[PDB]
């Protein structure tokens, strides 16, 4: 599970939920959505990711350099995650009505899902880092 901290001022934490929401939108809207409708949902995931990464970069200064590292670690990974979600989405768009019509959509669901899981692991490291740097406070 996740740390229980004071989330009221945790912009990281909120950006994670939003991203998870966007990812969740995608999941149970692919079956319904048309090909041009794919760009929009993938865009929101992207949008909430850049929000997220921005609020982590704002923090990265005030925290330990061994954590700066695996944070920057998964931050890199998340870009690689979005890259794949876009490209699988483009495939899915271009391969509506062909052999791997469905197979490309499975790949979108995978890519977004693993994006959500990584974002969580980002939150987790961030939580630990705040603790390790006397920065964290218990739920209010």
């Amino acid at each position: 599970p996740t740390a229980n901290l004071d989330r009221t001022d945790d912009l990281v934490y909120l950006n994670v939920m939003e991203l998870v929401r966007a990812v969740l939108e995608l999941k149970n809207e692919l079956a319904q959505l048309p090909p041009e409708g794919y760009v929009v949902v993938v865009k929101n995931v992207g949008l909430t990711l850049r929000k997220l990464i921005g609020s982590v970069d704002d923090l990265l200064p005030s925290l330990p350099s061994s954590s700066r590292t695996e944070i920057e670690g998964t931050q890199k990974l998340l870009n690689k995650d979005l890259a794949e979600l876009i490209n699988k989405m483009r495939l899915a768009q271009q391969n509506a009505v062909t052999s791997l019509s469905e197979e490309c959509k499975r790949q979108m669901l995978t890519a977004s899902h693993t994006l959500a899981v990584d974002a969580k692991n980002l939150l987790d490291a961030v939580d630990q880092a705040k603790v390790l740097a006397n920065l964290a406070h218990p739920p209010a």
Binding site: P1, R7, Y13, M17, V20, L24, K27, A116, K120, L123
Partner: peptide, 11 residues
């Protein structure tokens, strides 16, 4: 904390 429940919601 309840993001965990949001998380298992992805499954």
């Amino acid at each position: 904390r309840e993001l965990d429940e949001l998380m298992a919601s992805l499954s």
